[PDB]
């Protein structure tokens, strides 16, 4: 299973919401009926961090600005009111079948 | 929770290392563990995965027949062996834990097989590195 | 993300093995005779009647063989013994020739003309036995 | 010495009976978003995906021309088809006269002789008033009577037209087939399997693979491929076969389209019942066409000839079929609700003997709206127009050859749709497990 | 062309013979209670055929009599039910005539066979 | 505790002393007990149209038959045919539960045992059917030995 993302980098304004989408080749609906999409966050020089561990539901300890959506192969991640703790690397991971591939990866930046 | 690593350093091509990943306050016989790999200036990869049963292990395609994953449920440790080290393995090796515990193997009655279940991530490790060099 | 663990015996896995080691797996086929994939975890569709017909057929065939076990002396059992002596005109083969050498589906194509004659003699010696077990309890 | 009857229960034997199968669902992330023809939400779910047990040391005779899974699947695809069209709107107020003249108008200069607006007196929702209503109609879907002449529809002489409900999708979502308890499906895994005969590698499955109900003539679309080289399957080698099933190894990617930005209007003919016509085409009217890549069609058609030599020693002439009706003469398929009819006379032109890659073959495709499905008469169906442009991109995964000097000729096939389902259901059959066995051992019932 | 070979016990057959000779052909008539010689009312015919069979099999399971043709219970035969001798029952009487003799007393006897199984206390 | 499901709540030492209450409602009082299903058939004969409540009585009969036979088959493959408490030769593996007898039989209900052992019963049932099949083979050729 391959993964591609749009875009490769964002250039946004603090207080303005944005969004990052992932695209899968094969549909990721398991036989449980629940999908296998994972939204991560790596600060530079830091360990990664889960944000959304399905299509929808949010990790215990993440603020409600991060909402997830989608079904089938089309998926998005809509940040609400981008702030100073929302810059770095955003990843997509599937866990439908081995090997557990990661996405390409975005680089969210502001305009200094 | 706390996830501690060690065992990383600098070797030659064609050597053997032994990474380690000791956990803090788990049941740890319920949670299957992972190993991801991040080259400098690249994205993440996936290397290996052992179960909490310590019975079924899987590897990535590029690393097949070279690595060896084991665990000790008494000592609460991970034991990643490596063999015949290439040059392109200069990266950072993080152990990891699924966000929920997989249960037991589920016996399918029609074909008589046991099945394990794998899913995502909670806690990456500290992040240790192995850099292969000549001198 | 799944993975194959340890393996055990499976359905029809001893077909064409032999005749003496395929009788050590009798429960594996006897488990898959009543409940199939039809039972999972809005009305009168074409696929709705065709699913309901598969559930009425699966009870009628199960009760057919389960009736026929109880008419014999063999209810709730997997291997039972009768008092009907084997007749060599049904088949003349040796004891080490059908065991350890023959398989089922080769023995099935051999005596399938004689089963209706065999089935009648098992039922007849069960009437004769149960009358005698009655008439032994008058002392 | 003394042998005795002992009966066993749980014995692995099987007869070769035939029964009623049922379907299963394949990973549909819709879960009743839209509805389609095939009613795939009514199928059952499964928490393990269907599996496959390799059976050792058993051989088994298969026969793809007497398999009854094909005749059972053919009655089900027609049954699901007629279930959907029954609540849709009856369309008897179009059996009237159709007075019209071709269309009005860098230049458009195409489609002038295959399409025309036709005005007519429809019914309103009051059954006392008439409304003067125009609609674009294809030239195939009109008949002369005896500039502005008078026309009427095709099957208004013979049928009663019902249009298709536009929410219902024609997309072939895959369907599995599963067996009830006490039954089994045995598949043949052997690569050199020629349709009939025995099979030394059989395995048993819970359900089949995903079979897409794709309806097509003369070519097979979105099907399966071959493991080794090209397999060629006829009924019986007795010089009366007349149908050849070719299964390719690598596909030939048909891409096929109609360029037009046509519209769709809604016209009320009664109490809530609405007729969906074709309003106007925005922009340049063009023909409909499929492209075939001339490079690997020449490669794939040559490998078919190499394997026809192993059955037949005569020389090979691929000549296009000549017939009366337009269905078994062209290549009919479906793009999301539009029924194409493509002239494949150039794909089947050449002749071959016992002994180019720049361009792309372009096929002229007609298109029509009133459809006589499943070779039946009296139950025509009006496919409504689709707004905008449509585009398909499918795979030729096989083809059907009908057989008609010492130089044999293979016309392109078509017609019967059961030959579509023998392409997929050839490699497995249904058996019936019989658990009671009986054999002589040395143990006798110890009485009382 | 079809001939006819040897003749064995047919379906009813011993319906007119005595109750000592009709109790050796019990297996012949038990085979025909379920099988038969057989589209929504196509199913309701089958489900009644199954549930007429399972109603008599559960009633034999309430008693001690599961999985056998002749069974024995420890209810005493009350001599007011029928007072006939043993030889004029088992040698001079059919089952169709005995069925009319104790047709009044059927629900009384079934109520006692069921009670003496709850009084095992084992 | 007498009454249908009345022992739900008591510990499983005392809830297993009255198992007759459950194995009579689930063997007798299901198909044999009711004769009023064929009193609603003639009322369905009076009306000439198949109603909605006639379809639901098919699906409540075929669920009632299958629920009865898929618990008698499973007691038939094992040696426990016409009885309520039976013993087997399968040794209890402590990786199924390491818990002591006094905690199980005297401080835990049956409904708290369902929510502990349910992942393991498909493995446990394989070992009861296998040991029953090994037993009847052994007592056949022992029988044929003398
Ligand atoms: C009770 O119970 C319990 C439990 O149970 C369970 O559970 C349940 C629930 C159910 O399910 C059941 O069924 C189960 O079972 C029990 O227990 C058990 O038991 C059993 C027996 O009986 C057992 O088994 C066993 O197994 C084993 C394993 O095997 C595997 O592996 C191997 C290897 O091994 C490894 O090695 C390594 C090296 O190389 C190591 O490492 C090391 O380590 C150390 C520490 O220790 C350190 O660290 C160092 O450093 C290092 O180096 C490790 O450790 C090891 N491990 C182990 C575990 O051991 C091999 O060889 C084999 O082969 C196997 O393998 C596998 O295989 C498979 C197949 O192929 C695979 O799969 C696959 O994969 C792929 C990928 O890769 C894909 O995915 C596919 O799909 C799939 O399929 C896998 O993977 C693999 N894995 C691996 C890891 O590799 C063995 O060994 C053993 O054996 C034994 O026996 C035999 C015969 O008899 C002999 O011969 C030998 O010798 C021995 O003895 C066995 O079999 C188990 O384990 C257990 N478990 C536990 C938990 O314990 C009990 O039993 C009961 N009880 C009673 C009484 O019974
Ligand atoms: C039998 O098999 C079952 C599975 O069988 C399969 O599935 C069934 C359906 C069937 O299909 C079978 O055929 C299959 O084979 C086993 O079921 C497992 O049950 C466990 C719990 O019993 C469960 O693990 C938990 O998962 C959650 C997340 O997953 C839940 O939520 C998502 C989203 O809603 C949902 O999609 C999931 O399905 C799941 O929902 C739960 O599902 C189960 C069963 O379906 C239901 O019963 C639940 O009601 C339902 N819950 C909800 C809310 O819907 C994890 O997040 C969670 O882990 C965190 O919490 C635990 C709390 O104990 C923490 O553990 C403690 O950690 C301490 C560390 O200091 C330590 O000191 C303590 O000792 C330790 N406690 C114990 C008891 O050891 C744990 O560490 C986590 O805490 C988090 O840690 C992070 C790291 O720092 C922090 O960042 C977080 O903030 C922190 N969060 C909190 C809240 O603290 C827990 O592991 C499994 O999901 C479930 N399996 C599967 C596959 O789903 C069952 O166990 C088997 N055995 C038996 C006997 O029944
Ligand atoms: C052999 O196999 C091949 C491959 O499997 C088949 O080829 C496929 O055929 C199907 C037809 O069944 C094609 O699906 C249709 O594609 C239409 C084109 O979509 C693109 O354009 C539109 C508009 O520009 C975009 O919205 C689309 O974007 C969406 O899809 C992409 C991926 O494709 C996603 O990434 C996006 O996120 C979007 O989700 C595409 O760019 C498409 O319009 C159409 O969907 C409409 O039609 C169906 C029924 O007609 C409706 O159920 C559906 O909801 C849509 O309906 C809306 O739009 C129409 C018209 O606008 C209105 O009439 C409705 O009222 C409603 O508003 C459908 O998805 C598929 O594209 C094609 N595969 C490829 C790769 O091209 C072959 O057909 C098969 N061979 C045979 C013989 O069947
Ligand atoms: C097809 O015929 C219809 C007639 O109903 C044309 O529609 C209108 O016709 C009137 C009179 O002929 C014109 O004055 C209008 O300009 C037409 N167009 C409208 C109302 O949009 C229609 O133009 C014809 N041609 C097509 C559909 O190509
Ligand atoms: C729709 O109906 C009207 C009458 O209600 C038809 O108009 C007549 O047409 C004929 C020939 O076209 C003329 O000779 C009459 O003079 C017309 N009468 C009126 C009152 O206009 C009209 O032709 C019908 N349309 C169609 C397509 O048949
Ligand atoms: C149409 O043909 C292409 C090949 O040109 C198919 O794509 C391959 O599909 C198989 C699975 O059947 C994969 O294993 C290959 O990796 C695919 N290759 C490429 C290049 O995509 C495609 O699946 C076919 N379409 C359909 C609907 O079957
Ligand atoms: C097997 O061969 C026989 C020839 O004896 C085929 O019978 C003829 O088939 C052709 C076309 O298949 C028909 O046009 C003829 O009318 C058939 N002859 C008769 C007398 O009916 C037969 O079709 C072949 N088997 C299969 C399955 O096609
Ligand atoms: C079918 O083939 C035709 C012929 O090449 C394609 O038409 C060409 O499209 C390109 C755009 O990529 C234009 O630049 C050319 O001018 C077109 N050719 C001509 C002769 O005008 C067409 O795109 C193909 N269609 C599909 C769906 O592949
Ligand atoms: C039919 O359409 C497909 C659409 O993908 C064409 O495939 C593309 O062709 C162009 C031109 O060579 C390439 O640049 C693309 O990379 C191709 N895409 C893929 C996925 O292969 C195909 O060539 C067309 N065929 C014909 C005969 O026109
Ligand atoms: C498919 O197209 C070809 C090429 O146009 C047609 O074949 C010839 O068409 C011309 C056009 O008038 C005729 O004069 C020739 O007699 C045709 N040749 C043959 C051998 O038939 C062909 O008719 C078209 N097929 C269909 C079904 O329209
Ligand atoms: C029908 O009734 C006759 C009455 O004579 C039965 O024949 C006698 O049955 C008794 C029963 O033991 C025998 O002892 C006699 O020897 C029989 N008489 C003759 C002449 O054979 C007859 O058996 C009854 N029918 C059936 C089918 O049993
Ligand atoms: C045997 O049957 C006789 C039938 O005459 C029973 O006696 C009568 O039973 C009814 C119903 O219980 C009572 O109303 C009568 O009063 C009884 N008669 C007398 C004289 O008391 C008798 O109970 C049955 N049982 C035994 C063991 O004799
Ligand atoms: C298949 O046959 C071989 C020898 O012919 C035998 O050794 C093997 O056990 C057989 N396989 C099975 C599953 O019985
Ligand atoms: C049957 O087997 C016996 C061996 O005792 C042999 O004598 C006889 O010829 C066999 N009959 C046939 C028909 O093979
Ligand atoms: C209906 O009329 C057309 C017009 O000529 C004719 O070709 C067709 O055969 C007719 N259909 C019949 C009579 O069934
Ligand atoms: C219910 O709980 C009370 C309090 O522990 C106890 O005395 C009583 O015996 C219990 N009854 C049953 C039926 O378990
Ligand atoms: C299970 O019970 C044993 C004693 O029976 C004990 O030694 C062990 O620690 C228990 N397991 C756990 C995880 O506590």
Question: Can you describe what's shown?
Answer:
The structure is cut from a larger assembly and holds one copy of chain A (about 110 residues), one copy of chain B (about 140 residues), three copies of chain C and one copy of chain D (about 450 residues). With about 110 residues, chain A is mainly beta. Chain A has one domain. Chain A has no helices and nine strands. Chain A has a five-stranded mixed β-sheet, with no helix packed on it. In chain A, strands 1-3-7-6 form a four-stranded antiparallel β-sheet, with no helix packed on it. Chain A is globular and about 45 Å long. Chain A starts with a strand and ends with a strand. Chain B has one domain (about 1-135). In chain B, the strands form three sheets. Chain B has a six-stranded mixed β-sheet with strand order 2-12-9-4-5-6, with no helix packed on it. A four-stranded antiparallel β-sheet of chain B has the order 1-3-8-7, with no helix packed on it. Chain B is globular, with a radius of gyration of 16 Å. The relative contact order of chain B is 0.29. Chain C is mainly alpha-helical and about 140 residues long. Chain C is about 45% helix and about 10% strand. Chain C is built from five helices and two strands, in the order βααβααα. The longest helix of chain C has 26 residues, at about 45-70. Chain C is extended, with a radius of gyration of 20 Å. Chain D has about 450 residues and is mostly beta strands. Chain D contains three helices and 34 strands. In chain D, strands 16, 17, 18, 19, 22, 23, 24, 25, 26, 27, 28, 31 and 32 form a 13-stranded mixed β-sheet that branches. Chain D has a five-stranded antiparallel β-sheet with strand order 2-33-13-15-4, with no helix packed on it. Chain D has a three-stranded antiparallel β-sheet with strand order 6-10-9, with no helix packed on it. In chain D, β25 (about 330-335) and β26 (about 340) form a beta hairpin. The longest helix of chain D has 17 residues, at about 70-85. Classes of the chains: A mainly beta (about 110), B mainly beta (about 140), C mainly alpha (about 140), D mainly beta (about 450). Chains C and D meet through α1, α2, β2 and α5 of C and β1, α1 and β34 of D. β11 (about 115) of chain B pairs antiparallel with β1 (about 1-5) of chain C, so a sheet runs across the interface. Bound molecules: a molecule of 10 linked components (NAG-NAG-BMA-MAN-NAG-GAL-NAG-GAL-...), a molecule of 9 linked components (NAG-NAG-BMA-MAN-NAG-NAG-MAN-NAG-...), a molecule of 7 linked components (NAG-NAG-BMA-MAN-MAN-MAN-MAN), a molecule of 2 linked components (NAG-NAG) (9 copies) and 2-acetamido-2-deoxy-beta-D-glucopyranose (5 copies). A molecule of 7 linked components (NAG-NAG-BMA-MAN-MAN-MAN-MAN) binds near residues 171, 334 and 336 of chain D. Chain E: This is Envelope glycoprotein gp160. Chain E: It is found in: Host cell membrane; Host endosome membrane; Virion membrane.
